[PDB]
């Protein structure tokens, strides 16, 4: 889910609880049409987050999501290259 993940990542503590929630979320699959919203939220939290391990897990997760079904990732590579430049 999109809003549920957003609010859960907002309310979770930065260093460990957010990492655990991302770990739980990475296991369960995501429907292709909903990939855009969840990766947008992950990017927003990537900008917010200061911890390196949490950002690393966000990068790994949002790379994993790009392999899901016939999803078209041509809309999520400008923000990806941007955050890569800023990382």
């Amino acid at each position: 889910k999109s809003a549920a993940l957003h609010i859960d990542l907002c309310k979770a503590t930065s260093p460990a609880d957010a990492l655990q929630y991302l770990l739980q979320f990475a296991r369960k699959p995501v429907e292709a049409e909903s990939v855009e919203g969840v990766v947008r939220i992950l990017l927003e939290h990537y900008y917010k987050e200061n911890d390196p391990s949490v950002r690393l897990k966000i990068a790994s997760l949002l790379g994993l999501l790009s392999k899901t079904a016939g999803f078209s990732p041509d809309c999520i590579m400008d923000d990806a290259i941007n955050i890569l430049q800023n990382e």
């Binding site: 941007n82 430049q85 800023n86």
Partner: protein
């Protein structure tokens, strides 16, 4: 830094035709000095707003009250400490809230006691930082430069513009008007958080915290100790020593108090 003492030494309200060359030279020098001061203020106090989307977007700094000067023996006033603190801070010049303009003569009334290692330069950088108010005041003395500065502030949306906001924050910081700095701090949260450019986003913004600390310092200079303490608590959750990080802003709030 000291070149404005010669340009401003001529007749401010000189003849448009008889002294056309002198007026044009004075206006050009005033505009250049104002641009240099704005650029320096933006670089020193607005590191996040001056950085693009692919830039580092570092934590911005801020300028605080000269509390060290009052504590130091250079400005050890035996009977000018309680009521003259606002006077020592602003010089009773920046009464009005001047956006993108600094109307203050504190550069000549006092100085900045900076050693060789405390600041970047004991002659160049310190004088350039202190003379910004004097150069801007000299520019405001000339009608053409003042009109150009006012037009720039009006057209550029000085609250939204990075350089003009930094200049306004520096002017309010030295003036002691905590309300302008508080308004800038409030606008520095939503402006930075809602912009797609790379900066400090959300309530925990470095620029917003630095502006809040500057507002606390201005309130302390104005004598409103309760307001300064409230601003310091909110932030926690001519020259001065302060780091550009947001973490160091919290431990420096109590210095003004």
């Amino acid at each position: 830094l000291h070149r404005m003492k010669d340009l401003c030494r001529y007749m401010n309200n000189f003849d448009s035709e008889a002294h056309a060359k002198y007026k044009n030279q004075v206006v050009y020098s005033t505009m250049l000095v104002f641009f240099k001061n704005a650029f320096q203020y933006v670089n020193s106090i607005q590191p996040s707003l001056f950085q693009g989307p692919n830039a580092p977007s570092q934590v911005p700094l801020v300028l605080l009250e000269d509390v060290s000067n009052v504590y130091g023996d250079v400005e050890i006033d035996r009977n000018k400490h309680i009521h003259k603190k606002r006077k020592l801070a602003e010089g009773r010049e920046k009464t009005m809230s001047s956006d993108d303009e600094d109307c203050s003569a504190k550069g000549r009334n006092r100085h900045i006691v900076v050693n060789k290692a405390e600041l970047a330069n004991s002659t160049e950088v310190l004088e350039s930082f202190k003379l910004a108010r004097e150069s801007w005041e000299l520019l405001y003395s000339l009608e053409f430069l003042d009109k150009e500065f006012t037009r720039i502030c009006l057209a550029w949306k000085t609250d939204t513009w990075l350089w003009l906001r930094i200049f306004l924050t520096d002017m309010i910081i030295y003036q002691g008007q905590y309300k302008k700095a508080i308004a800038s701090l409030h606008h520095l949260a939503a402006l930075q958080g809602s912009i797609s450019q790379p900066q400090i986003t959300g309530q925990g913004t470095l620029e917003h915290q630095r502006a809040l600390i500057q507002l606390a310092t201005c309130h302390f200079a104005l004598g409103e100790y309760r307001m300064t303490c409230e601003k310091v608590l909110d932030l926690m959750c001519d020259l001065k020593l302060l780091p550009c990080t947001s973490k160091a802003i919290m431990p420096y709030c109590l210095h003004l108090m």
